[PDB]
């Protein structure tokens, strides 16, 4: 308190000579970050994203935060990679219920679905976001035979972890653009496909399409999704 409020580090050096044992102790101690935050201007395109920086959307500010300074994140936890996301894309038909939420976004359209099986980064990006934040709702739409996606965050306070983004950009690179934006107080990540490159894998469209048709859409899901579909249509136009 009283010493702490008064001493500058230019005065501690003659003191650390007498006590070199306490220097390391002093150095390690200073680990509570105060800086590493900055505002972000919407719509926030992810080419503007600063490397190794989480995003924090909240009533207390839409701001990017450095990973060392980030306290909402959890040091112990391991988030998947774009490669894990690809493996998940490959094994879709084994995890239909897990990924129920992703399939609802197609709104029972088999054309939009067939496009997804030619465009892995769509599933990948969903998979990657979902692992970070389970409370998201994707909506799929197509233009010129290219699948695009909008991912709505259900909650108003949204924290996008740093490594979740790094992986996103890996799955999205060159062909896609990603933009974060708020609409009607909700966060919406927009993934735009510029070009459909060749996929070197082939997902069994039939067993996927047929198994998706069989699923029932719950009324909680239906009514919640019903609310959100409008929100996107208002941001588009």
Partner 1 sequence: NKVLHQDLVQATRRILKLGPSELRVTDAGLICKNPNYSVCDAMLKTDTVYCVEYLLSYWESRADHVPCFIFKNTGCAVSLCCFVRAPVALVSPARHVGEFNVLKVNESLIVTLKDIEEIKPSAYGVLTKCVVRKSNSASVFNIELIAFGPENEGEYENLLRELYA
Q: Which is closer to partner 1, CB of 15 or CB of 201?
A: 15
Site for partner 1 contains 26 (CB under 8 A): yes
Among candidates 179, 163, 101, 104, which has minimal Cα distance to 136?
Answer: 101
For 127, other C-beta atoms within 10 Å of its C-beta total 25
What are the angstrom distances between the C-alpha of 140 and each of 63, 172, 232? 27, 16, 10
* Selected binder of partner 1 within 10, 76, 206, 237 (CB under 8 A): 10
What are the angstrom distances between the C-alpha of 39 and each of 49, 50, 62, 119, 203? 12, 12, 6, 33, 41
Site for Zn ion contains 53 (CB under 5 A): no
For 83, other C-beta atoms within 10 Å of its C-beta total 12
Q: Which is closer to Zn ion, CB of 64 or CB of 92?
A: 64
> Nearest residue by C-beta to Zn ion?
54
236 vs 121: CA distance, rounded Å: 21
At 148 the three-state DSSP class reads strand
Site string for partner 1, 55-84 (x = CB under 8 A): -----------x-xx---------------
Q: Which is closer to partner 1, CB of 53 or CB of 190?
A: 53
Site string for Ca ion, 2-41 (x = CB under 5 A): ----x-----------------------------------
Q: Which is closer to Zn ion, CB of 121 or CB of 161?
A: 161
- Residue written as tokens 């107080």? 185
Q: Which is closer to Zn ion, CB of 130 or CB of 148?
A: 130
Partner interacting with residue 73 (select from partner 1, Zn ion, Ca ion, none; CB below 5-8 Å by kind) = Zn ion
Tell me which stretch binds Zn ion (CB under 5 A): 11-19, 64-72, 84-92, 93-101. 64-72
For 154, other C-beta atoms within 10 Å of its C-beta total 15
* Selected binder of partner 1 within 48, 52, 201, 210 (CB under 8 A): 52
64 vs 57: CA distance, rounded Å: 8
Site for partner 1 contains 34 (CB under 8 A): yes
User: Side-chain half-sphere of 76: how many Cα atoms within 13 Å?
Assistant: 0
Tell me which stretch binds partner 1 (CB under 8 A): 25-33, 74-82, 105-113, 114-122. 25-33
34 vs 19: CA distance, rounded Å: 28
Tell me which stretch binds Zn ion (CB under 5 A): 66-74, 77-85, 131-139, 169-177. 66-74
Site for partner 1 contains 3 (CB under 8 A): yes
Q: Which residues bind Zn ion (CB under 5 A)?
A: 54, 70, 73, 161
């Amino acid at each position: 308190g009283p010493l702490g409020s008064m001493l500058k580090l230019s005065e501690l050096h003659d003191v650390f000579q007498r006590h070199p044992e306490l220097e390391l102790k002093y150095l390690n101690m200073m680990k509570m970050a105060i800086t590493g935050k900055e505002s972000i201007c919407l719509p926030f395109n992810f080419h503007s994203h600063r490397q190794h920086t989480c995003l924090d959307i909240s009533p207390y500010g839409n701001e990017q935060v450095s990973r060392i300074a980030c306290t909402s994140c959890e040091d112990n936890r391991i988030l998947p990679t774009a490669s894990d996301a690809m493996v998940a894309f490959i094994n879709q038909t084994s995890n239909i219920m897990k990924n129920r939420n992703f399939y609802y976004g197609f709104c029972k359209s088999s054309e939009l679905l067939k496009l997804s099986t030619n465009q892995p980064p769509i599933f990948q990006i969903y998979y990657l976001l979902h692992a970070a934040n389970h409370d998201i709702v994707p909506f799929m739409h197509a233009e010129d035979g290219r699948l695009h996606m909008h991912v709505i965050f259900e909650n108003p306070d949204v924290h996008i972890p740093c490594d979740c983004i790094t992986q996103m950009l890996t799955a999205a690179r060159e062909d896609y653009s990603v933009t974060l934006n708020i609409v009607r107080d909700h966060v919406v990540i927009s993934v735009l496909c510029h070009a459909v490159s060749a996929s070197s894998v082939k997902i069994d469209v039939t067993i996927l399409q047929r198994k998706i048709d069989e699923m029932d859409i719950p009324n909680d899901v239906s009514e919640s999704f019903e609310r959100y579909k409008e929100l996107i249509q208002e941001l588009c136009q």
